[PDB]
Amino acid sequence: YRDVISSFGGKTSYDADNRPLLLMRSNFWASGYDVDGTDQTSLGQFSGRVQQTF
């Protein structure tokens, strides 16, 4: 309904269609580093861990 009103050039409050009010949105990407194996079997393979502050 709020899209139909917007096409005419009007607007509706969030109480008109009984919808929640958005306050803030945040978007980010998570990265990390790698850990190397050092024993006989795993010398040459790696394991990744993701740790990101926000």
Binding site: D3, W29, S31, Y33, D34
Partner: peptide, 26 residues
Amino acid sequence: MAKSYRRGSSGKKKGSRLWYVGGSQF
């Protein structure tokens, strides 16, 4: 250690809209 080729799947969008699903979708 790797920014451009690990973050995202394409380039920045500077052009016309591509997708129309009937409204906002997040």
